[PDB]
Amino acid sequence: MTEYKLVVVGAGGVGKSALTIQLIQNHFVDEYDPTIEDSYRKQVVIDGETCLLDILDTAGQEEYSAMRDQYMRTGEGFLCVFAINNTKSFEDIHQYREQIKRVKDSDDVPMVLVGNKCDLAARTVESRQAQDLARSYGIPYIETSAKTRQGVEDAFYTLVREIRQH
Template sequence: MVIMEGQGLSRGRSLLTAVRIRKMQLKIVLVGERRVGKTSLLERYLKNHFAEAYTGTLGGRVYPTDLEIGLDGEDIALAHIAFFDLMGEHSVRQVFAEPFFFGTQGVLAVCDVERPDTLHLIKDWMEVMTKIAGPVPVGIAFNKIDRADSMAIGPEETAWLRKEFPTAPMFMTSARTGQGVEDAFSTIVSLSVDAVLAKGRASRSGRLFRQRILLFIAVRGNLGSSKAELFSEFKAVLPAQIMEELDNLVRLEALALDPSGTKTFIKAAEAPGTTRYWATDRGKRISESPKGDELMIEEIV
């Protein structure tokens, strides 16, 4: 399957039969040393094109595309994906690391099968990326597999890679022939979509629990509730999560540390167990109709 740059192509079911359409924006970056074939892989994937002459990337370049991706059930994701291609110079990496990696949702790391050093240096790229973007799905492409006769990466290198990146899928790719290219990109796109959806589910779960805490405190009226009472009521929930949501509710002015509603903020983790919380007038309104207050909505970026 060929994906044309900047155009949409359905992968799976039709929009006409979709139950829900989920729109999202993804940022997927390609990392690796110079001349490993990052740009060539992108050109093959997005344009079905391969240039024999080498042209190095200056700084970085963005390749946008739109995809329709079939999800579990009958849902469809409409994903606008920006593939970022960065020049494989370490000095450039240091200068552009923050804007290049910030907001990344997936990474395809590329090495050259003829140059074992390009495999080991993937670790350096990933360390810089992770410091900025945090943990995200990663795939590793062993590129130029069409030159298998001169392949210099063997069992020792792959064993090291498995130890460093135990969950990362690996792909044998050739930008020249197209071997493995579709599989590599399709997999990292799917993993990135799954990660974004999982983050959304976790966010929704957090909002529901936040509303449960607020309702519990609101119905107690002037009594309010102490931290210890909340820990006892929600025994199945980690205290750290309860305290995080208490802080969120105080910031949203749905709870107060004073029955009069005085604006005071003390981190729940630093407050004694006897510290009491009361629902404010705003909190009472939210507890009666939690979906009607936009302060309770969190956006996934």
């Protein structure tokens, strides 16, 4: 049935894997193991539609990013993740978005901006700053915590809702 190909991108350590694993497997990964390229598939009902999520969890560490752009080519929508306690990861978002536009050869690609680790109080990216970035892109901004589950389903389901607008 309806399949949605989602790709999760962003700087090393922002919580791409923890977010995906919380969504799919319902637990929090406390440790840090850098990703090369992993995929997950699960059947879910989203707004009354039974569908299949195929999620590519990509490397954020440059050293482990070989051929990432090839893996990403098939993505239908992209979760652009930064951490709210990592200003550099937020600044990097523009470069991830440019890479997405390159691999899709389009300036109109479904995406959602995600500010993760919202359970932490060492915030250096304020909500309004991320809202403004997302506005400039024509996409939603959503905050998440892979640790508490806050916003996790919402982030991924919102991306499906963006793909459906394409």
